[PDB]
Amino acid sequence: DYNHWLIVMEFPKDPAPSRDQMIDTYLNTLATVLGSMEEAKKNMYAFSTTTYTGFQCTIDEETSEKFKGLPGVLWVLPDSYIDVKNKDYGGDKYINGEIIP
């Protein structure tokens, strides 16, 4: 069973929202599913606004369905790479509220 999900989102191409605004959308999208913005910030562990626009998070399969239909949500994929050495989606890391360089 898949416990970790890649949520791919879409943003208006013009004018394009800023990196910060995209990340805020991710967190608000997770917060909607999880219950709270604080849960979201402690859950999400990776994301992108460049190589792709989406984020990675941990929910059970049934809950991952709640992402479909939410504004901006495009595609809900299982995270194959969270635990594979030397493979990733080309994303950035996010740890408990802080973007990692």
Place this chain on the structure above:
Amino acid sequence: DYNHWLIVMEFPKDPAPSRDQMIDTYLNTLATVLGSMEEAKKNMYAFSTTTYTGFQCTIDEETSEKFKGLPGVLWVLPDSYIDVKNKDYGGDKYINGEIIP
């Protein structure tokens, strides 16, 4: 045993390509990696144009790296669902030239 891949692709949005053109691109992209359109058509077993944008296929890991040099290839992911009952990506099936309705 065998390695099964979801190849995720991206297409321009203005103008957008047609379904037929995307499917052709999947087969072209696979054919380039394989070195044969004939092999590509026997190999590819599923794809999407709606629910997602990409296709599934069976090659070894080394050969699958050839996709990453090709235009439109975003991710080269392991197929998560090919051997899992009652779970799939929602893609359409493709069988030796037949798009399966």
